[PDB]
Every structure is written in structure tokens, then in C-alpha cells.
């Protein structure tokens, strides 16, 4: 099953992420709506 | 067909296939990205998204473009 905003711990430093922040594109998501292509 | 692929450019080095494909899966079901090579074996500095579905083409760019990878802003691009 799909898990918006849940990442590897080499994407989190990759997007600069610490530890219990969101990452920037969950920003994004939750205005966009539920993406596409993993909807069931 | 190229209705299901995405230009993804201005990748830091350190950016790898990989690493691509579990941010754009964010996106939609990604089928697979390349990050092609040239003659002499040197990976280029972008790379080429393929979805399972076009509709998550589209979505993609809105969700990640400018998004930074090590402190450089991914620049997507249509393909079609
Ligand atoms: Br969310
Ligand atoms: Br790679
Ligand atoms: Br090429
Ligand atoms: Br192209
Ligand atoms: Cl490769
Ligand atoms: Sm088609
Ligand atoms: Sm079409
Ligand atoms: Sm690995």
C-alpha cells in the first residue's frame, strides 16, 4: 500500500530533512490532493 | 510511450537512479528512471522518469519540480 511522505533515511539527508519534519513535498501534496496514480 | 515519461535536470552528482526513483514513486508508480550515460562511461547530470501511468506525469512535475537534491533544485521538464 502507498505511504504518502514516508522516506529512506538517504532521501531524508538527500532532501535535507531532519529527524521528525516533514519533507518539502508533503507541503505540496496535501494542497494537490491524493496523487493519481496510486489511487485504488 | 513519451506520454509516460518525465526530464528530470540540474542534478547534483551524488544523485543516483535510485534515489530518484523512491522520490518521483512518491508521485505514482514509477516504472523506472535512467540516467543516461556518455561514450566514455560518465554518468550525464539528468535523468529520465518513466511512470506506469501518464496521469502521474503531470502531477509530478506540480509535487517535485524545484525540489532540492544535496542543495540543488531539480528541473523537470515535459518530454511530450
Ligand atoms: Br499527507
Ligand atoms: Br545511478
Ligand atoms: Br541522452
Ligand atoms: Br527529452
Ligand atoms: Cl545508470
Ligand atoms: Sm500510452
Ligand atoms: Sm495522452
Ligand atoms: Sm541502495
Same mark, same amino acid.
Given at each position: 500500500?502507498?505511504?504518502?511522505?514516508?522516506?529512506?533515511?538517504?532521501?531524508?539527508?538527500?532532501?535535507?530533512?531532519?529527524?521528525?519534519?516533514?519533507?518539502?513535498?508533503?507541503?505540496?501534496?496535501?494542497?494537490?490532493?491524493?496523487?493519481?496514480?496510486?489511487?485504488? | 510511450?513519451?506520454?509516460?515519461?518525465?526530464?528530470?535536470?540540474?542534478?547534483?552528482?551524488?544523485?543516483?537512479? @535510485?534515489?530518484?526513483?523512491?522520490?518521483?514513486?512518491?508521485?505514482?508508480?514509477? #516504472? /523506472?528512471?535512467?540516467?543516461?550515460?556518455? =561514450?566514455?562511461?560518465?554518468?550525464?547530470?539528468?535523468?529520465?522518469?518513466?511512470?506506469?501511468? @501518464?496521469?502521474?506525469?503531470?502531477?509530478?512535475?506540480?509535487?517535485?519540480?524545484? #525540489? /532540492?537534491?544535496?542543495?540543488?533544485?531539480? =528541473?523537470?521538464?515535459?518530454?511530450?
Amino acid at each position: 500500500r502507498f505511504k504518502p511522505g514516508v522516506i529512506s533515511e538517504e532521501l531524508q539527508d538527500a532532501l535535507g530533512v531532519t529527524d521528525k519534519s516533514l519533507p518539502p513535498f508533503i507541503y505540496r501534496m496535501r494542497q494537490l490532493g491524493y496523487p493519481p496514480g496510486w489511487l485504488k | 510511450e513519451a506520454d509516460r515519461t518525465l526530464f528530470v535536470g540540474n542534478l547534483e552528482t551524488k544523485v543516483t537512479e @535510485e534515489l530518484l526513483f523512491e522520490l518521483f514513486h512518491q508521485a505514482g508508480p514509477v #516504472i /523506472k528512471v535512467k540516467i543516461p550515460k556518455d =561514450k566514455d562511461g560518465k554518468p550525464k547530470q539528468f535523468a529520465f522518469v518513466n511512470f506506469k501511468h @501518464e496521469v502521474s506525469v503531470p502531477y509530478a512535475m506540480n509535487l517535485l519540480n524545484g #525540489i /532540492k537534491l544535496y542543495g540543488r533544485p531539480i =528541473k523537470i521538464q515535459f518530454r511530450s
